[PDB]
Each structure stands twice: as C-alpha cells, then as structure tokens.
Design a protein around this ligand. Structure first.
Ligand SMILES: Nc1nc2c(ncn2[C@H]2C[C@H](O)[C@@H](COP(=O)(O)OP(=O)(O)OP(=O)(O)O)O2)c(=O)[nH]1
Ligand SMILES: Nc1nc2c(ncn2[C@H]2C[C@H](O)[C@@H](COP(=O)(O)OP(=O)(O)OP(=O)(O)O)O2)c(=O)[nH]1
Ligand SMILES: Nc1nc2c(ncn2[C@H]2C[C@H](O)[C@@H](COP(=O)(O)OP(=O)(O)OP(=O)(O)O)O2)c(=O)[nH]1
Ligand SMILES: Nc1nc2c(ncn2[C@H]2C[C@H](O)[C@@H](COP(=O)(O)OP(=O)(O)OP(=O)(O)O)O2)c(=O)[nH]1
Ligand SMILES: [Mg+2]
Lengths: 481, 481, 481, 480
C-alpha cells in the first residue's frame, strides 16, 4: 500500500500517506460528504455546495504544511514523522463531529432539543474518532507506521478538544507545546482550520479571500515563551494578523450570518424538532434513536447526515405532515419575513437565558399607530448573534507572540496602540434580527411598527430603514435624532 | 414581486426576472440541488460537489447574455423581451430531466433496467417542465409578463428537445431561427450549456478552463444562411472554436471518463439494479413507483434523486443487503480493480450489440502463461467509451457559419485546411477499459495476462504498461514491435 | 472609423467606441505606457510591472459600465449617448497628468524642486488633455459623433479636476449632478478609478482584492438629496462600503507605503534632483526644459516618463556622475537603511511646516549608550505618512446616501453606530518612518539608539522592535513598560 | 540571509543569499527593462511584464523540481550544491535577451548582422560570465560551498548545452537528469516553459490549461541508456501532448498575433534605420551600436527597450526616419494586414526564398482593373514555423515513462497507444502578407495581388477570399 494524490481546487495536489488513506476510507469519515459546510447558506449562495469532507482534507493538508515548515526551518525542535502524522490525523479528523447542515445542528437544533446537555462539535469529533479507530482496526496500522497508539491517540484527541483532564497535556510534553497551536488553537484562534475555510468558503461563495496563509507559514517560527516552545509570528505581520480576524468577521457578516440563510437554518431546525418523534435512526445492536438522541450512539450518528432533510421531504407518513410542510414552504420560498436588525447600546449585553423573553417583549410593545392586525409573541422570531474575534471581549492579538528580524529567537509582545489607531476599539458585539412568521403585507407592517417601538423602548440602535418602515415611530425617539 | 439578484462563483451577480424566480422556486426545479453534476466524479475529485441546480442557473444566465448581445448589436432582428424570457426559461430548464448521479442514470442505469425504452435527459426535461408548469400555476404568471403560453411553451420545449414530431418548428418561424441555436444547438453543438459546464466543472475539479465564451459572444452576429437567419462567428475565431471541442475532449479525458469515477458509477448502478426490486417511491395518487419506473410518472421522478444512494446505504432491510454491501464497499474503497485500456485499429468499430459478448472474450483468452488461478466471464467488466466532437464522425466546424470584418452580413464557410495542418484528422474514436471484480493480487495478474493476450488477438493497440504487466506476451505481437 | 475590442486581464473584453480609439492613439495618451502605476513598488513587488496606460483603459471601461447601468435602470434620468461618451473620455483621461514613477513625481519630487507651485496630477491631467485635443485634431471627431466641444470638453475637464472656478459646474446642469460622481468623486471618494486600481494593483502585486465593484454597480441608483440628484447605494451595502475603504487602507499598508518602496522612490527623487541641472528636454519650438520645468510645457512633459531614470543611469557625462551614482546604488541594492516606525500618541498631530525639522531632532537626541560613531541631521530621513479614508478626519460614509428596498427613490443617511461597534473610531492617523543614509552596521546601531531615544523624548509610541534594537533605552520610559 | 519575494504567479519565493547577490547586479536588474513579449504589449495591454520577474519564476521552479526529485529519491545523491547550481541556471537563462525580447533575436540581429549566429542562449552565457566577473561572485560561491570552476561550467552547460560519449564536464552521467530541468535539449519539457505559460497567461488575460505541479508530483528519475533521466508516469502522456498543444495555442493567439508581429517588424525597421547613429558606450569608453553591442557585454548591459524611447524622443535629422516610424506606431498608422495562407502538400518554404516572396506577390496579375500598381517594396511577407519544438519530430517520442507496477523501469509510448485525435503532423508554416501602403485603393489592390498569388501557387484559400477578392477566387476550381 502506498500514498495517494488528490486534486483539490483550493490546494492543488495533496499527498496522502497510507495511514491517512486508511482513516479516510471509512464510513465514519466518508459520512462527511453528506453534510454541507455552510448548511442553509447553500440556499442563498448557490456556489456553496461544498461539504465537510473536502474541508477536512484541506485542514489535514494545511496542518501537514505548517508542521513540516516548522520542522524544516528549525531542526532543533526535534519534530518526528510520528508528530507530523499525528498532527495530520488531528487536522483531518477535527470535523468528524459535525451534524446535519453543520452549524444548524450544534448551534440551533441540539441546544433546543437537548438543553440539558452541553454538546460541541469538538466532543462529537473525539467520539466519532474513537468509533472510527475501533470499528476499522486502525491501531495496528498506526503501529505499522511507527505510531504509539496510547500516547498518540491521546495526542490527537487533545489537539481536537483540548486537555481531557501546570502542563495539562499528556499526549506531548511542554517542549512540543507549539504542536497544539496548529489544528485547533485554543490560545488565540490562529489555526489551519480557519485558513482552509477562508480559502474554500470564499472559492465557493463567490467572495474573495484577502488572507495569505502561505505568507504566515513562511514567517512563523518557534520561540520560548514562559517555559513552553510556542509559535511566534514575525513582528511586521501583526497588521495582517488583525486583518485575518477582520476577514473572519466579514465572512460572518456577508455569508455565515446572512439574514435569509439564518432564517432557513431556523425553519429546518423547526422541521427537525417537529419530526424528532417519528424519524428513527438504527444504531448499534439494532436499537432505535431519534435525531436528538443519535449523538448518544456513534453508529447511529454515523448515519445522521443532511439525508434527514430529504427523508422528511419525501415522506408519506401522516405523523410527519407538519414537518414536511415546513420543508415544503422552504422549497416554495415561502419563508418567514425579515423585519429588521438592531443593536444594544451602552454596556448592555443580552444573555442566553433571556433569549426566550424577547419575542414576548416585541409583541408587548405599544406603537402609537393605526394597526389592522394584532400580532402575538409566537408570531415573532428574535435571533441574537454574538460577533467577536473568537475570544469573547478579548483582543486575540494580545495573545500572540512575535519575533524580530534582529533576534529571531526572542519572543516579544505588541500592543494595539503600537499598530494603528484605525483598528477596532471593541472586539465583541451583538446583532439582533427580528423576523415575523405571518407573511401578509398588513402583518408585516404591524410587525415593523412593533419592532421599531421595541427598539425605541429598550434604547437599541435605530434600524437602518427606520424612517421608511415606521415614519410615525422614529421621531418620538430623540436619541435617534 | 421584483427581480432577485443571485451571486454565483462563476458568473458573479445574476439578475433573475420575477417569472424566472417563480419558476425556480418549485419542487421540480429545487430538486436539482440534490443531483451531482458529475456523479461518481465527486468520489475522485473532492471539489466536484456541485449540483445540477447552480449549473441550470448559469445556463439560463448565459442564454440571456447571448440573446441580449445579439439583440443590442442588431435591432433589425426584432428580438422581443418575450423571446429573451423564453430563451432564458429554456436555458434554466434544460437540466430538469436528469436523474440520480446525472449521467450514471441515463448512460448506465436506465439502459440496463429498461432496455425497451429510449430515454434521454432531454425528454425528461420536457416532461418535468410540463409537470412544473401544470403543478405550479405558471401559465397565468407567464401571461402576466406578456408571454403567450401555447406558442411560448411550445418554443421552450422545442429549444430543449427539438422538433416535436420544410421548417419543422412551431414555436418560432425561420426569421428567428438563430434563437434555436442558443440553449441546445442541434446544428453543431456550440451552445451556452457547454460554456457554463466548462467554466463551472473546471472551477470545482481544479482544472483550468481555456475557452473564452465572453469573447465568442462579443464576436457573434447573425447572418443569412440558405434563407435562414443563423448565428455566425467572426472568421478569426475558427481556431478557438476548434479548441472549444478540444477542451471538451480534454475534460472527458481528465475527469468525466476517469477510470475510477466510471467504475464507481458502475458499482452504484449495480447496487441500484439489486435494490431495484425493493425501494418504493410514491407517485401520483399513492401509486407505488420504482427506481427504474419513476420516469413514467413525473410526481414520482420529482422525488428520485441522489438520496436513493443514502436510502440504500442506511437501510436495514435484508432484501436490500445485496445492494447495501456494494455501496459499503465503495465507502471502504474496495473497488473493482483497473486492468487496462486499449483501442481498436484500422476500420474496427465495436458496436453496441457486442458489449455484452466482450467479457466472455477476455475470459476466453489463452495466453500461454502459468496461472495459479483461471477467471470467468463474470469477473470482467469491459467498458466501451465513444469519444467524439459531438457529431459522430463529423467535423462540427464544417457546420459553422462565419463572417468577415469587411462584410459583416455575409456568411461564409471555413474548411479545416484553411486553419491548420495540426488539427485532428479524425473526430471520433473508441476507448476500451477493462476491470476485474476479483481484487486479490493473483487474480489481478491473471486478469492482466488474459487482457493483454485479448488485445493481441483482436489486434487492438498495445496497452501503455504492456511491457511491464505482461512481459511474456508482448513479444508475440510484431505490430507492437 | 469603427469600434475596437481590447482584451484586459482584469475586465476581459473591453469595447472602445471609435472616438475613444481616436483619443487613445496619440502621443499624449500612449505616453502612459512608459510610467509605472506603483513606481518604486515594482522594485519590491516584481509582479507590479503595470503602467498608467492599462489602468486608464480600465477606468474608462468602468466609468462606461456605471453610467450605462444607471441609464438602463433609470431611463427617467435622460442619460444620453453623449453623456456616456463624455464620462468614458473623462475616465480614460484622468491619469494623463502623472509623471515619472507616478506618485514619486507628484508626491516627492515636485514638492521639493518646485515648492512655489501647487501642482497636482488632476491639473496636469487637464493641461495634458487640452494639449491632446489641440495637438491631435480631436474636436471635429467629437462633433462627428454628436458631441458639442465647448460644453463637453468643459464637462470632461470638470470631471477630472472639479469646477474651473449654487451649482458650480458649467459642463452639465443640476439634473445631471450624479454624473460628476463617477470618475472622480469629490463628495466621498467612491469612484471607478479606485475600483480599477483595487482590482489591477491586486492582480499584479499578488494580493487578493476584497471589494466587489460589480455588486456595488448592481445596487446603485440615483435619488434626490437636497435638491441634487446623487448616486445612492442600497442600505444593505453600508458594511461593504466601510470595507471598501478598509481595503484601500490595507493596500496602502502592505504595498503603496511599503518602507522599502518608499525609500527607493526617495532615492530616485534624490537622483532626479541631482540630475536636474544637466538633463535637457526639448519642448515647444526646439526650446529646452528641465525635469523640474517639464510641467510648464506640455510638449516637453509629453516626453517626460520613466525613461529619465534610464537616461540618468546610462549617462557618461561627468556632470551626471553623482545622480548616476545614486541610481547605481539602487541596482546593487545599497539602499538607505530603515531604522524604524512610530506614531504620535493621544491627540497630537505633526504639522507639515515641522517635517523639515525632524532629522535634526533625531540627531539631537541623547541616548545613554556608548557609541563610536556620531550621526548628524543630514544622515537621517524622517518620512511622515498620513493614512486616512480620503477625507482627512471625516468619515466618508457620513457623506454617502442610501436607499431602502420599500422606498428606493427615497434617500437616507446611515451613521457609524447603526452599523457596527467594531469599525474604526478615527479615520486619520500618521506613521513616522525613520531611515539612516549611512549603511554600515555601527551607523545602523547608533541610528537605532538615536531613533528610540527620540521616540521616548517626543512621547511617541514604542516601536515594535524597541526592546530588541534598543534594550538600553526602552526601560527608561514607564509609559512603554 | 534569505529574502522572500512575493510573486503573483508562485506566491512567496524564498531566495538563498547567493541568489540574492546574483540578482542585485546591473547585469540582472537590466532585465527589468526588457518586455517579455515585446510588441505583444501593444496588442494585449496586460502584457507589461518583463524578463526579470520571469527569470525569478524560472529559478524558483528549477529549485522546486530538483528539490522534489531529491526528496522522493535520496539514492540520487542530489546535493545542496546541485540545488543552488540548478537554481542559478534557472535564474540566469534569460540574461541574453535584447530589446523587446524575440524581436531582437528573431528579427533585428538576423538582418543587422546576417553573418553571426547569435542566440539568446549564447548571450545568456556571455552575460552570466560578465556578471560573475564584474561583481566578485566566485568568492561568494565558494563561501556557500560551491566550487566555481566545475559549477560555473555546469551552470553554463545547463543554459546553452555542451560547451565544446558523455559531452558534459559540469556533472557526470549519474547526474544527467539535472540537465533536463532548466533547458531540456532532449524534448523541450523544462520549467522555463512552465513559468512562461502561467505568467504570460496571467498577463495576457487568457487562461493556462497546463498543470506543472501535477507533472512535478508524477515525475521520477529512471535509468535509460547508461543515463539517469527524468521519466513521467505513463498516464500523464495525454497531458504532455496537451502541454505542447497549449504552447501552440499561445503562439496562435498571442505570440504570433498579426498586429503584434507587424509592430515588432516596424520597431525592427526603426532600429535598423537608427543603427548608425545610436551610440552605446562599452568597455574602455569605446562606443558601440545597437547591432554591435552584443560584442561587448558592458555595452549590452545598457541595451534595453529604452532604445525605443531614445529614438522616439530624439531631435536629430539623422534619426528622423527612425523616429517617424516609431511615431506612426503611436498614431496606430500601422502597415496593413492583407491576409494569411499556408503551403499545401509536403512542400515547404525555405528561409532562402523568404526575400523573394514579396517580389512574387507584386508580380501576380489579377484580372481586375486596378487604379494603382504596387511594387515589391510595398509588401511584407512574414513566414512563421509553427511546431512542437523539435522541427518535424514528435517530442513525446523522446519522453521516458514509468508504470506504477514497476516505477524504476523506463518505457516508451507511441502516438497510436494514446489517441487517434492527436495531430498527424507536428510542424507547419504560416504565411502572412502585409501592405505598407495604407490608403484604401492600395489595400484593395493588395488584396487582389495576394489572392491571385495564393491561387498561382496553389496555396490555401484565404478565409475571407470570396469577400476581399470576389473576382479572383472563381478561377480556382478547388476553392469551388
Ligand atoms: N489536474 C489533474 N488532476 C487529475 C488528472 N487526472 C486525475 N486527476 C485527479 C483526480 C484525483 O483527485 C487525483 C488523482 O488521480 P489519478 O488518476 O492520478 O490516480 P489514480 O488512482 O486514478 O490512478 P493510479 O492508481 O495512480 O493508477 O488527481 C489530470 O489529468 N489533471
Ligand atoms: N459578493 C457578495 N454577495 C452577497 C453579499 N451579500 C449577499 N450576497 C449574495 C447572496 C445572494 O446570492 C445574493 C443576494 O443577496 P442579498 O442579501 O443582496 O438579497 P436579499 O434577498 O437577502 O436581500 P433583499 O431582499 O434585497 O433586502 O448576493 C455580499 O456582501 N457580497
Ligand atoms: N482571449 C483572447 N484574446 C485575444 C485573442 N486574440 C486576440 N486577442 C486579444 C488581443 C486584443 O487585445 C484583442 C483584440 O484582438 P483582435 O485580434 O481580435 O483584433 P484585431 O484588430 O487584431 O483584428 P481585426 O481588426 O478585428 O481583424 O483581443 C484570443 O484568441 N483570445
Ligand atoms: N502577500 C503579501 N506580500 C507582502 C506583504 N508585505 C510585503 N509583501 C511582499 C513584498 C516583497 O515582495 C515580499 C517581501 O517583503 P517584506 O516586507 O516581507 O520584506 P522586507 O525586506 O521589506 O522587510 P524585512 O527586511 O524582512 O524586515 O513580500 C503583505 O502584507 N502581503
Ligand atoms: Mg481619487
């Protein structure tokens, strides 16, 4: 058995070591071909047909690239082929945990269907990885290629999800700390996963990516930082680093958080919730699971893909009527109507426990206008979106180590004032989108009045179209004028 | 209802008239989101995740582009916006008839399941279009936008499939003849459908497209050709036109006819054949249809997509075991092994009615070599592939009209000798690919011996790896030496 | 006589009306083939070989595109073919005024050699366009294609430079105000010139551009804003607008203001200053001019291009030795050394009249470090760069009007807080770069010491490599530690 | 230390300090002032790229190929010395080009000095020697582990071939494959082509079909005839044919563009009219001409596209006629394209007869009334040999292949084993005819003469034959 070459639109010709090939050629990995990277985004950006599978290949490739470059520049790090293979495997497998329509599953469906559990795609990925190894006798192949399965499986899982619970890692010692910054960077979020999705998502969406991962790779080194060996970027790349996150933000504003994409995710979630009692997924020992419980059995989860959508759409079962209908409404493009967007002012933040209270608040608004219809709380959808640089309120560049030309081995820090006064003063904010489930002109008008009045009452920002959609409300709010 | 703008990775921002929007937002059209453009190609080129849907959008867009250019350069053709809309609709809808995994369904599955029928994706597109129209109340929307449904529906269908059986079309008369050359060009095959798939497939496969359709559009006029107003190209462009077909050939060589992608379409077709007795698809009136018979009822065929693959894969029904296993072997990458490629010589033309006899012939070869194992007819797959410029043995450029800069309204002919002595001297050929279903090393060596001796016997071309896989057989053939 | 097609790597096939071709095929215009768009940038980014000529073609093309789109969507604006042609000509001709190495000439050389005249590339463009018209018999051609030369040349000039001095323009009445917002937008800087240079400079530099001008064009309309018709953008696009300027800033940071690119422009400028007494340029009537005086005779300025560089480089004249010498140092890559970059803190700005005193300040600093070399003012270069969004301190998005989907003829304003809290809080800043004209190690060490001490003394920002290049200076400053 | 350079084609290119020392000389930086495609820029405005960036690209790709080969096959004993030398060879194999590139070696020199056998290869060797010697590079070379005598020999050999049974002195037979990288004398598959495909395509605004990276990945070193040579994987054969196809296409669309060619022609004419008056100072303060600067590398260093502008900006009467020609180019008053034909049959047009062809066209007798008479002096006849780089040969016949079942074993693949749709021939000629008289009467007349001349010699029927000469084509029964 030998290496295989794969041609990828983003990276060109990727070499895949036989062990990696063995891992890829499993039902657990091949499953990723049937899950859309951007989920509902595909129904807004037609080019976004790409799946988690090709992305996974890309991430494995890039992890390989960065670890190899680091090894070639700095022999003294003692990076082994075993290290390279473990980092490649981690990169390759860090998307195994995703569910139907990707972020629709972990971001919307699971939190609603199973609020008592704290599910993440990372946990899902380690579980699916374990299932993959155990179902396909991978351990002897790992040993055959020089790996030490106990240590190395620990290492890979640690790369994916973090310490499994003072150096908290068992897979590798502190002198290899930098290896943990490659596939999933918990320290500052700068990892190859982002690079691949920037390039790939851009390629498919019809948006241009402005981040140069190659340049970053060429200017990266390993330096000592607080008794670990960590990845450091050349000082003059700091601007580019800020720009990387800017790029991420932009991709979220244009595509990932598109109003219509989000509402389509929401409707699919509604359909899944209404179908959860009736769809059966047959897992280990012939036991039967729901969509909401497939996460409890990896054999079942292996069979849980975008297919579900179609299974609901093509169904005849009367019990599934209500689910089916919603999906049908998606096909006819009879979607919930976007009412508007606003933001909190002051220091005010909206917390997850208070999400449920928002539709009620909106309907309880009393706009001083002639209305024809009256709207209820259940007619309203309030979608709140946390936009940040990946570390909540923190500036992630404050967690980046740099090096200078004249002392390549000395790590330094760079503050925001040292770069540009035109950079963000803040690194997190919330966007509030309001939609209406009633799609008639009268109802839409009413919902617009309710929404603007609500915005005024809570001292939120004036909606961009406010004077147009509610010319009777906005002048009452002096804070807007 | 206003026009909508859609962002496409290939074409950028596409404007869609409200009528086209109404047509697109139906189950019949949205169905195409669930059928891979290149089918099994995705399992070889991971970037090739694109579906028939977005391709259809691109075809409609380019149809619009070309008819608009023709109109704006020559107002004397009296091209109406009704004509523009009908050409756009035809462009949009000429992929509606495709089935699961695209060509796998009409090039392999249907011919083997229903050999009595003569089914084409064109006819399917016609039927599905009629179904879409009737099921969605489109006729009065058409009327709302100035269309005359009888004549215009006729025109659209004629653009898709040709004369519905002197001037043979009922939709438009001779003075609009050129309109029939835009969406599906039966005259020489130069149409916008090709242009979109060149660009799109290249974008996803990771091959670069060297054909410039924008340039062709720029240089296109319409001149008089035997009392017909036909589309003519600028003389200068003849080389490019030749290369257009060359490009097609290359794309077929590199991707569409890739040995493994083809063997994978073959395995999926086998599994569809074995699942054939047991999968049910609900058609009109609850009547149970069928993978091989869903084509008889459009309401059912609307539900026939790539999902079938998954339905088989995820099944637990014992009757389906046989199909299931096959799909599973695709996931484990246990495919039929490629043995080789050869070509006929001289005047030999392998006919359709001999394909079935082919595996027996290889199996019945006597190579004068020691074999640990002998193999049977069953063990063999012989795939015959007809590569051509789209008009059998004919030069399609001989069916193209050109114009000269000094007299733009005067159509002329250009012959191959007026172009280059480096052009093809043939415009059709046959490729013979052989695989063995027995994948062990011993069996494969055997298969290679059998195969080469078969090539020497039928006086086919020597396989490229002939002197390495069968060294005790190649010195028998003097033509090969 | 007839239109021509030109194939451009950015825009593809560009159609040029015969009048435009007439204008283009003159010495005054073809001159632009011999002036690098990015000047000294080519000596850092080898792909940036592009000249002002191709950029001019692109700008004319885009101006045409925007005016055409506006006319097509809004026939009630009464945009004539004459308007379209005049906008195209202004677009084609707004780069005529550039001198050798573009921004090196108008940004560095002229301010030093002719500080009494207030020269701009705009004014130079007007003069050169006048010279083009008058030297090439263009007026009768204009008349031949339906233009009225007094009015229309006035219009074109006004598009290039602004009012030649209520409605201040004389080329077109108030109802055509929007037409002045296309080629050079003095209201907010959003124009087609930027769009072309974004795409082109990116294509050649090897940086991907983030901005989608086609999308902008699709979402642009004309609306009435305070008794004026202006180009308005869809509200939804506000984000992208901010990002446009972000892009500009980034392009300036990565490429246009690259420290080395700038130092090479500076050295070329020095050479030109040292060559000015001895270079002769034959102007009107055999009359001779200097590099510094070529601008007061258009006939001489026509022959003033990048060629000068080579003329100096290949000279044998003893009197040119020194100038030649400098150019030679550029070839051996013996450049002035970059010492560092810093910024003022808080609110303080560096006034222009103070620039000249800066190198003396650096040389006057007293770093507590033992040095063998003492440097003087003449050895220091202090380059002050104003980075902004094109309107000094003002947010240009505050000078954009938008429209909403439900009332697209109604113009509205959108404020920064209505968009995002992550946007810039300021729109102007200054970067101070310091170089040393002595290039030996010891001189560079000293220069670094003086520079960091100077930064501390003026309470400027701590340089990014401060602790590395000057470990004995930086701990003195508590604000830095 | 190393330097990184960002290139739009290859992205970030790392440059070893020795390469940097070589690049930062007047002899190398010279290439910034010579257009890759010359007159092509006056037709494809995106084609502003110069030989400098192309050279960087070639050096980079040479490095890539050698590194890949080494890493896949350690048994080859490819040293860092070998890598650096192959890189230098890649970087420096364009040093010999003159003003407007091929215009200078394809057109000017053959007319200015018809006795010399000038090639850009030899010029590259001479210029490389001049660079090394003028910039104290040999000590730097030994400073980075190279042995100047052997290695400079090796580099020159990579550039021009055997300087004077294994003909090479720079490296023995077990390193033969190294000579197949920068300039492949054997089959023309080299990294120089790869770079110009991608770069020229990027600037022209036409897309590249060929995937060099794939080739690099499916490339090996296998033993052939006591030589270790680069072999491609069998399945790549189609692609290889396509490579040459792409080349042909690029010549068809861009490099041999009728107007591009006529502009190179006009510039050549202007340089010829300027030759006696343009002084270029060389070694010793000696003065040279455009035509003789190739005899002194110091003067040649200063011979770039700038000549054009020096002629265009001149005032002296002696240069007027040169100057005027350039001015016509600016006014787009170009010589007029009359038409194109090809010779039929196995027959070919020898370079010996090229000078006679303009007389022939003016000697034709079209049976039509013509206002004007044209002289041989009024016609330009430009003949262009289109081929796969080995005259009449099929370069794929000179490629070695390997199969995945035994990848250390060279094999051959014939055209018949591949496809019936491939070219049946691998060389042909194109004849373009122009008229220096641009008035309408003259152009009509020229079209008559030309079509009649095509008829008289049984040349191929011009595509617009019926349109431009309707009275002429009927006599030729074969044209219908
Ligand atoms: N750019 C490009 N990619 C290709 C071409 N042919 C195949 N590919 C892609 C498809 C795959 O993702 C990858 C590998 O395909 P290959 O045909 O080279 O390997 P394959 O396993 O099919 O054959 P093999 O086992 O080596 O005999 O490259 C080609 O001619 N050009
Ligand atoms: N290139 C690009 N495409 C975008 C951007 N935002 C959305 N798109 C894509 C998605 C769609 O394919 C197409 C239209 O999206 P829009 O957001 O402009 O239309 P939408 O119906 O959502 O809003 P609307 O009804 O007009 O208020 O453009 C963007 O910022 N850049
Ligand atoms: N993409 C592409 N561009 C081409 C091709 N041939 C020429 N071009 C470029 C060069 C020019 O910028 C532009 C126009 O060149 P043309 O050859 O079509 O016009 P030309 O004046 O030479 O011929 P004409 O006067 O129309 O008989 O297109 C081609 O085959 N493909
Ligand atoms: N893609 C990209 N290229 C850049 C950027 N900045 C500069 N370049 C290009 C210009 C050069 O061709 C190449 C190297 O420039 P650098 O600024 O990295 O090196 P430089 O010598 O100026 O600084 P140094 O001596 O290392 O401190 O990269 C950037 O932000 N992005
Ligand atoms: Mg401006």
């Amino acid at each position: 058995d030998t290496m295989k070459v794969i041609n990828d639109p983003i990276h060109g010709h990727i070499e895949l070591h036989p062990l990696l090939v063995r891992i890829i050629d499993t039902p657990q990995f091949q499953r990723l071909r049937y899950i859309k990277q951007l989920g509902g985004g595909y129904y807004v950006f037609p080019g976004a047909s790409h799946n988690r599978f090709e992305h996974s290949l890309g991430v494995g490739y890039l992890a390989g690239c960065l670890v190899h470059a680091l090894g070639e520049k700095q022999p003294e790090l003692q990076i082994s082929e075993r290290d390279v293979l473990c980092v490649q495997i981690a990169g390759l497998c860090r998307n195994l945990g995703h569910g139907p329509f990707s972020h629709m599953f972990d971001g919307r469906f699971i939190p609603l269907a199973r609020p008592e559990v704290k599910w993440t795609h990372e946990q899902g990925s380690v579980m699916m990885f374990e299932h993959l190894i155990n179902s396909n006798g991978i351990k002897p192949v790992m040993e055959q290629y020089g790996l030490i399965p106990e240590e190395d499986i620990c290492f890979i899982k640690e790369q994916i999800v973090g310490p499994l619970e003072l150096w908290p890692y068992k897979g590798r010692p502190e002198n290899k700390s930098f290896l943990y910054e490659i596939v999933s960077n918990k320290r500052n979020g700068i990892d190859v996963d982002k690079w691949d999705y920037f390039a790939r998502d851009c390629h498919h969406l019809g948006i241009q990516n402005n981040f140069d991962y190659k340049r970053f790779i060429k200017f990266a080194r390993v330096c000592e930082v607080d008794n670990e060996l960590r990845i450091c970027a050349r000082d003059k790349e700091v601007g580019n680093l800020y720009d990387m996150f800017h790029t991420r933000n932009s991709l979220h504003r244009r595509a990932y958080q598109h109003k219509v994409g989000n509402i389509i995710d929401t409707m699919i979630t509604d359909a899944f919730l209404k179908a959860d009692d009736y769809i059966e997924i047959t897992g280990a020992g012939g036991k039967k699971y729901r969509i909401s419980t497939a996460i409890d059995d990896m054999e079942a989860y292996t069979k849980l893909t975008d297919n579900i959508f179609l299974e609901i759409l093509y169904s005849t079962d009367p019990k599934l009527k209500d689910a089916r209908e919603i999906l049908k409404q998606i096909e006819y493009r009879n979607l919930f109507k976007y009412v508007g967007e606003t933001q909190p002012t002051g220091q005010i933040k909206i917390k997850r426990e208070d999400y449920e209270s928002l539709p009620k608040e909106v309907a309880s608004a009393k706009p001083k206008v002639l209305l024809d219809v009256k709207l209820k709380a259940e007619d309203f959808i309030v979608d709140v979106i946390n936009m940040d640089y990946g570390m909540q309120e923190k500036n992630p560049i404050d967690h980046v180590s740099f090096y200078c030309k004249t002392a390549p081995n000395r790590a330094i820090r760079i503050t925001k004032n040292q770069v540009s006064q035109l950079l963000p003063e803040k690194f997190a904010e919330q966007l509030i989108r309001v939609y209406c489930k009633k799609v008639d002109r009268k109802s839409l008008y009413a919902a617009r009045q309710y929404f603007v009045q609500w915005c005024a009452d809570r001292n939120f920002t004036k909606p961009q179209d406010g004077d147009v959609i509610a010319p009777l409300i906005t002048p009452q709010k002096k804070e807007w004028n």
